[PDB]
Amino acid sequence: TSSVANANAQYPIGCFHFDEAYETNYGINNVADIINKALGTEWKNATRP
Amino acid sequence: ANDGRQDIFSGAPQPNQHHTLVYGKSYHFTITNGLPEFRHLATTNSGYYAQQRFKHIHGIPWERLLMYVSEGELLRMFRDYTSLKVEEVVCEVYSLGVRLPFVTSATTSSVANANAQYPIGCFHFDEAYETNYGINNVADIINKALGTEWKNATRPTAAVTTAWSEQFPNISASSTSRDINNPVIVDYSLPYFENNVPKDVGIYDYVDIKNGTTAYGKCWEKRFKPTNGLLYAESTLKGNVVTPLAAQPTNIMTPIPGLENGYFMSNDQIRERRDLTTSVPPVALTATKLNQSASNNLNAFVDYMGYNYFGEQKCAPQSMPKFMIGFVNIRNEDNSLLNAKWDILIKTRIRLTGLQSTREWVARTDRIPPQYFTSQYTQFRYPNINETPLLRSLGTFKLPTKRPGMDSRIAA
Amino acid sequence: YVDIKNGTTAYGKCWEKRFKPTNGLLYAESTLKGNVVTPLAAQPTNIMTP
Incomplete structure (x- = not known):
């Protein structure tokens, strides 16, 4: 029963940009996934059963 | 100039009465998290809808x-006037924090952590998509708002002293925090x-988020000055609730x-009227109060009740x-929902105008x-003045063009 | 109801008509009908x- 209840850990976050100095790339499925979740798939029965 | 031709007496009637009422309440409610869910709804007349509840x-x-x-104040103001109009309604929401447990315990859980910075907001996508509330859900909020009496206004045959009890069958939210779910x-x-x-609906295109932890106090305030705040109006000669017409329409x-x-x-x-074949379509006839039942009055809506002014376009305004x-x-890390409890305080104010012709x-x-005589109010009802008028859907529906959903409880 | 010109000397631009329609609506879609063939399935309710 874990719970992410602590928001006062002062975790460091940042904007990385070393993509301007070294070869970089993303995983094909990783990006594909982000986009499928962005669009999401339909669940409404546009066409009546 | 006083040539024995000027008026000696000049009569004039008494005025109409114009009273203004001002009421208001304050409540303490608590609401909680909930994941989104969907279903498909089938209804009579082959109705089919895709529903998404947040x-x-x-x-x-x-x-x-x-x-x-309160129900008491409503009863009175509903019998005292010829017509009653809502001038303005105000609703303020105060946040007392969004809490949750430090550690989830299946048994002795405690909402002791108020520093989770839970995001809270004011959603308003009800202006772009069809929305509605659950009938019992709203009914519940109101029963907890009013609360049921527990004092023995009428002494028991044996008016003896009883034991203290925290078990209020239904204490008002005006006296203590009470949970609501709508x-x-x-x-x-x-x-x-x-x-x-x-x-x-992309809810994030219709929300103003605040930090649940730092947003302590006044958060939102909504005001509304109804165009048609007509709660009721009497313009008929019907001097009873039971009597039906005696005369049929003439050639006059x-x-x-x-x-x-x-x-x-x-x-x-x-x-168009002719196509509503399932239920009988209402018609804008001369208004009455003797149409609404006691229970109907209790469910009165502030924006529109089916009554209109003689010179205005007979229809419902935008809700x-x-x-x-x-x-x-x-x-959470396992993608489950991080439960939280939100304590809010609500202040409500209302100004009405009563008329006595x-x-x-x-x-x-x-x-x-x-x-x-001089003029007549009108309401959406049926040639048979005793038939239930066009009622307001308790589910608080928002139909296309942003108008309030209404029922025609008269079967055709 | 006529404005006459000399057919021989009137060589070039003669008339020009303009019109700004009040209702120039050629078409508009406001229904949920997502087909050209499908008919309604639900009958009018009491709502x-x-």
């Missing part, structure tokens, strides 16, 4: 008159066999503006904005004087 | 607002 977005029924006035539901009509459907008739075209917003489409507030769900009507009975 |  269990983390709750709506304050500020459209309900009982949120400002998830907003978004409908996606599917009237055809093959429908054109939109992508689920004079053309009046009317301003009622017989067009309705039947769910997703516009329909007041829904007052929806809620969380912006945070999820006593100028052209000197009554010799307690019967309220009707706005009969 | 109706003026």
